[PDB]
Design an enzyme around this catalytic site. Structure first.
Site, PDB file in Angstrom:
ATOM      1  N   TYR A   1      -7.142  -3.754   8.573  1.00 56.32           N
ATOM      2  CA  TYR A   1      -8.575  -4.248   8.155  1.00 56.32           C
ATOM      3  C   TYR A   1      -8.710  -4.573   6.524  1.00 56.32           C
ATOM      4  O   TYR A   1      -9.820  -4.634   6.023  1.00 56.32           O
ATOM      5  CB  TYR A   1      -9.777  -3.020   8.537  1.00 56.32           C
ATOM      6  CG  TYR A   1      -9.298  -2.500   9.732  1.00 56.32           C
ATOM      7  CD1 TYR A   1      -9.409  -3.395  11.051  1.00 56.32           C
ATOM      8  CD2 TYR A   1      -9.067  -1.137  10.107  1.00 56.32           C
ATOM      9  CE1 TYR A   1      -8.883  -2.920  12.328  1.00 56.32           C
ATOM     10  CE2 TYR A   1      -8.974  -0.741  11.495  1.00 56.32           C
ATOM     11  CZ  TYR A   1      -8.999  -1.472  12.383  1.00 56.32           C
ATOM     12  OH  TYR A   1      -8.493  -1.038  13.741  1.00 56.32           O
TER      13      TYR A   1
ATOM     14  N   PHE B   1       0.746  -1.041  -0.144  1.00 60.43           N
ATOM     15  CA  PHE B   1       0.083  -0.074  -0.129  1.00 60.43           C
ATOM     16  C   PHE B   1       0.905   1.271   0.069  1.00 60.43           C
ATOM     17  O   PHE B   1       0.252   2.441  -0.388  1.00 60.43           O
ATOM     18  CB  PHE B   1      -1.156   0.148   1.115  1.00 60.43           C
ATOM     19  CG  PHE B   1      -0.183   0.106   2.590  1.00 60.43           C
ATOM     20  CD1 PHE B   1       0.455   1.336   3.097  1.00 60.43           C
ATOM     21  CD2 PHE B   1      -0.081  -1.118   3.273  1.00 60.43           C
ATOM     22  CE1 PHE B   1       1.057   1.239   4.146  1.00 60.43           C
ATOM     23  CE2 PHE B   1       0.681  -1.129   4.403  1.00 60.43           C
ATOM     24  CZ  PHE B   1       1.136   0.002   4.896  1.00 60.43           C
TER      25      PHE B   1
ATOM     26  N   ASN C   1      -0.266  -7.631  13.380  1.00 63.66           N
ATOM     27  CA  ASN C   1      -1.374  -6.803  13.359  1.00 63.66           C
ATOM     28  C   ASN C   1      -1.870  -6.451  14.854  1.00 63.66           C
ATOM     29  O   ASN C   1      -2.843  -6.142  15.079  1.00 63.66           O
ATOM     30  CB  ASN C   1      -2.510  -7.431  12.555  1.00 63.66           C
ATOM     31  CG  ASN C   1      -1.964  -7.158  10.965  1.00 63.66           C
ATOM     32  OD1 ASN C   1      -1.256  -6.297  10.524  1.00 63.66           O
ATOM     33  ND2 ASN C   1      -2.683  -8.004  10.147  1.00 63.66           N
TER      34      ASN C   1
ATOM     35  N   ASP D   1      -7.985 -11.416   9.607  1.00 63.47           N
ATOM     36  CA  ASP D   1      -6.398 -11.363   9.382  1.00 63.47           C
ATOM     37  C   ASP D   1      -5.474 -10.988  10.480  1.00 63.47           C
ATOM     38  O   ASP D   1      -4.381 -10.265  10.274  1.00 63.47           O
ATOM     39  CB  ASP D   1      -5.997 -10.547   8.184  1.00 63.47           C
ATOM     40  CG  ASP D   1      -4.647 -10.706   7.646  1.00 63.47           C
ATOM     41  OD1 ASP D   1      -3.933 -11.793   7.712  1.00 63.47           O
ATOM     42  OD2 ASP D   1      -3.897  -9.582   7.173  1.00 63.47           O
ATOM     43  N   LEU D   2      -5.796 -11.656  11.791  1.00 66.63           N
ATOM     44  CA  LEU D   2      -5.074 -11.141  13.223  1.00 66.63           C
ATOM     45  C   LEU D   2      -3.817 -11.873  13.329  1.00 66.63           C
ATOM     46  O   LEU D   2      -3.791 -12.240  14.303  1.00 66.63           O
ATOM     47  CB  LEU D   2      -6.103 -11.067  14.105  1.00 66.63           C
ATOM     48  CG  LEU D   2      -5.738 -10.308  15.332  1.00 66.63           C
ATOM     49  CD1 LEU D   2      -5.410  -8.668  14.932  1.00 66.63           C
ATOM     50  CD2 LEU D   2      -6.986 -10.258  16.559  1.00 66.63           C
TER      51      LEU D   2
ATOM     52  N   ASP E   1       4.703  -3.992  17.258  1.00 63.62           N
ATOM     53  CA  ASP E   1       4.241  -5.310  16.906  1.00 63.62           C
ATOM     54  C   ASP E   1       4.482  -6.303  17.534  1.00 63.62           C
ATOM     55  O   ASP E   1       5.686  -6.527  18.152  1.00 63.62           O
ATOM     56  CB  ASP E   1       3.760  -5.509  15.401  1.00 63.62           C
ATOM     57  CG  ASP E   1       4.798  -5.935  14.745  1.00 63.62           C
ATOM     58  OD1 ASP E   1       5.622  -6.947  15.044  1.00 63.62           O
ATOM     59  OD2 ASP E   1       5.359  -5.293  13.895  1.00 63.62           O
TER      60      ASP E   1
HETATM   61  C1  LIG Z   1       3.953   0.515  11.116  1.00 58.45           C
HETATM   62  N1  LIG Z   1       2.868  -0.277  11.187  1.00 58.45           N
HETATM   63  C2  LIG Z   1       2.775  -1.404  10.444  1.00 58.45           C
HETATM   64  C3  LIG Z   1       2.903  -1.179   8.847  1.00 58.45           C
HETATM   65  C4  LIG Z   1       2.330  -2.302   8.138  1.00 58.45           C
HETATM   66  N2  LIG Z   1       0.896  -2.768   8.543  1.00 58.45           N
HETATM   67  C5  LIG Z   1       0.908  -4.219   9.115  1.00 58.45           C
HETATM   68  C6  LIG Z   1      -0.155  -2.093   8.039  1.00 58.45           C
HETATM   69  O1  LIG Z   1      -0.137  -1.041   7.583  1.00 58.45           O
HETATM   70  C7  LIG Z   1      -1.585  -2.624   8.777  1.00 58.45           C
HETATM   71  O2  LIG Z   1      -2.556  -1.546   8.897  1.00 58.45           O
HETATM   72  C8  LIG Z   1      -2.225  -0.634   9.652  1.00 58.45           C
HETATM   73  C9  LIG Z   1      -1.263  -0.172  10.272  1.00 58.45           C
HETATM   74  C10 LIG Z   1      -1.169   0.746  11.246  1.00 58.45           C
HETATM   75  C11 LIG Z   1      -2.410   1.509  11.541  1.00 58.45           C
HETATM   76  C12 LIG Z   1      -3.432   1.320  11.119  1.00 58.45           C
HETATM   77  C13 LIG Z   1      -3.590   0.285  10.004  1.00 58.45           C
HETATM   78  O3  LIG Z   1      -4.656  -0.320   9.493  1.00 58.45           O
HETATM   79  C14 LIG Z   1      -5.849   0.401   9.477  1.00 58.45           C
HETATM   80  C15 LIG Z   1      -5.768   1.220   8.283  1.00 58.45           C
HETATM   81  O4  LIG Z   1      -4.395   1.406   7.767  1.00 58.45           O
HETATM   82  N3  LIG Z   1      -6.506   1.638   7.463  1.00 58.45           N
HETATM   83  C16 LIG Z   1      -6.602   2.499   6.117  1.00 58.45           C
HETATM   84  C17 LIG Z   1      -7.882   2.797   5.834  1.00 58.45           C
HETATM   85  C18 LIG Z   1      -7.627   3.189   4.247  1.00 58.45           C
HETATM   86  C19 LIG Z   1      -6.728   2.238   3.847  1.00 58.45           C
HETATM   87  C20 LIG Z   1      -5.923   1.707   4.925  1.00 58.45           C
HETATM   88  N4  LIG Z   1       0.263   1.225  11.839  1.00 58.45           N
HETATM   89  C21 LIG Z   1       0.435   1.569  13.046  1.00 58.45           C
HETATM   90  N5  LIG Z   1      -0.261   2.660  13.594  1.00 58.45           N
HETATM   91  C22 LIG Z   1      -0.076   3.173  14.815  1.00 58.45           C
HETATM   92  N6  LIG Z   1       1.170   3.050  15.219  1.00 58.45           N
HETATM   93  C23 LIG Z   1       1.722   2.085  14.855  1.00 58.45           C
HETATM   94  N7  LIG Z   1       3.071   1.495  15.572  1.00 58.45           N
HETATM   95  C24 LIG Z   1       3.457   0.368  14.690  1.00 58.45           C
HETATM   96  C25 LIG Z   1       2.670   0.335  13.698  1.00 58.45           C
HETATM   97  C26 LIG Z   1       1.609   1.220  13.916  1.00 58.45           C
HETATM   98  C27 LIG Z   1       2.840  -0.853  12.612  1.00 58.45           C
END
Ligand SMILES: CN1CCCN(C)C(=O)COc2cc(ccc2OCC(=O)NC2CCCC2)Nc2ncnc3[nH]cc(c23)C1
Ligand code: NA
Ligand SMILES: [Zn+2]
EC number: 2.7.11.1
Length: 341
Positions: free
Chosen positions: A231, A38, A197, A192-193, A154
């Site tokens: 999600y 993404f 995640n 997908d937990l 994580d």
């Molecule tokens: C870097 N991060 C792992 C990155 C890679 N990875 C596993 C993802 O991306 C998974 O999905 C999310 C990651 C975060 C936040 C929200 C996500 O989901 C909802 C979403 O983005 N909705 C969006 C709505 C529209 C499309 C997606 N990431 C984080 N948020 C806050 N603090 C954090 N600390 C560590 C991390 C992190 C891990």
């Protein structure tokens, strides 16, 4: 350009520049914390407080990280799911803070900021990246920029860092409660937990609070607050309208190997007869079993279970592992399983 920004909670209309979301000081403090197909995720500071910034290219015709960009219509369902889950922190009958908090959502236009390229490069040099360096975007490029509360690190990256299996118990209890509350409120399945995640951050609160169908309870924190993320595959509903990812014709999702994670995709498809719009909260139990399995087999703790009290916790988590697949939902687990009494 006649839409309001951040779901109507920002007064700007039409796309905004990166500088709207990342004024100079916020931009200068960005450090990359993760990635996927993404796009990119950075941590920065706003009002002395860490936040996460997730940046996704949308609407363009060319490949990014080997895949086509989503359209806004394609990404909107996941924005809706993220917001619904975040809003559970302010609800009454079904309330939880266990999903990642969503601060704001913007549609941004422009080329990628050079200060973010610098942060991308630093991550590439230290951890290594699977992604294209994002320096090829033109001044017409649109992005969705999401600001989340900072959730920590994580569970997979904390494989060797947790105090003891008492901590593991808290984590499992927090996850079970958050999933139960979302089942009750939204007929939610995460789907997908895996351990990438589940995020962990320090808290000074000794107990965490949730409300399930009007009944409030607490969970001892062991000094950590859990946040659920990602999600991509999730499903929920409101007033009978279902939002879900239709993977009924996907093949590769179900042909994985080498980790129990990949069995869970197959076991989900078995449970739901490949009909992904239906509600099967057993999938939440399957993921919680996968997580419990990781806790017992792949995590290593700073302090082992040396006393009979701690050996008993270990035994009870082993008993949870052996019995939990006989429960119908995270709600059933939370309300009926002996581990949480
Ligand atoms: C870097 N991060 C792992 C990155 C890679 N990875 C596993 C993802 O991306 C998974 O999905 C999310 C990651 C975060 C936040 C929200 C996500 O989901 C909802 C979403 O983005 N909705 C969006 C709505 C529209 C499309 C997606 N990431 C984080 N948020 C806050 N603090 C954090 N600390 C560590 C991390 C992190 C891990
Ligand atoms: Na939260
Ligand atoms: Zn704004």
């Amino acid at each position: 350009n006649l839409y309001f920004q951040s779901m109507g909670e920002c007064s700007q209309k039409g796309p905004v520049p990166f500088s709207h979301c990342l004024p100079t000081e916020k931009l200068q403090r960005c450090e990359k914390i993760g990635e996927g197909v993404f796009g990119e995720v950075f941590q920065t500071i706003a009002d002395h407080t860490p936040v996460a910034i997730k940046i996704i290219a949308i609407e363009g015709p060319d490949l990014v990280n080997g895949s086509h960009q989503k359209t806004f219509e394609e990404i909107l369902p996941e924005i809706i799911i993220s917001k619904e889950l975040s809003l559970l922190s302010g609800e009454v009958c079904n309330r939880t803070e266990g999903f990642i908090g969503l601060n704001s959502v913007h549609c941004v236009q422009g080329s990628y900021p050079p200060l973010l390229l610098k942060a991308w490069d630093h991550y590439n040099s230290t951890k290594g990246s699977a992604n294209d360096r994002p320096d090829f975007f033109k001044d017409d490029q649109l992005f969705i920029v999401l600001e989340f509360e900072f959730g920590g690190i994580d569970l997979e990256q904390m494989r060797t860092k947790l105090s003891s299996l008492a901590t593991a118990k808290s984590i499992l209890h927090q996850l079970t409660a958050s999933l139960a509350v979302a089942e009750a409120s939204l007929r939610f399945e995460h789907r997908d937990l895996h351990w990438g995640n589940v995020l962990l951050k320090k808290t000074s609160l000794k107990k965490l609070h949730y409300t399930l169908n009007g009944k409030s309870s607490t969970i001892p924190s062991c000094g950590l607050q859990v946040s659920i993320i990602d999600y991509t595959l999730s499903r929920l509903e409101r007033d009978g309208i279902v939002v879900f990812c239709d993977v009924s014709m996907d093949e590769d999702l179900f042909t994985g190997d080498g980790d129990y994670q990949f069995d869970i995709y197959r076991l989900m498809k078995k449970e739901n007869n490949n009909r992904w719009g239906e509600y099967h909260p057993y999938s939440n139990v399957l993921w919680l079993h996968y997580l419990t399995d990781k806790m017992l087999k792949q995590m290593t703790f700073k302090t082992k279970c040396n006393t009979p009290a701690m050996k008993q916790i270990k035994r009870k988590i082993q008993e949870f592992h052996r019995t939990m697949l006989n429960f119908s939902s995270a709600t059933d687990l939370l309300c009926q399983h002996s581990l949480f009494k």
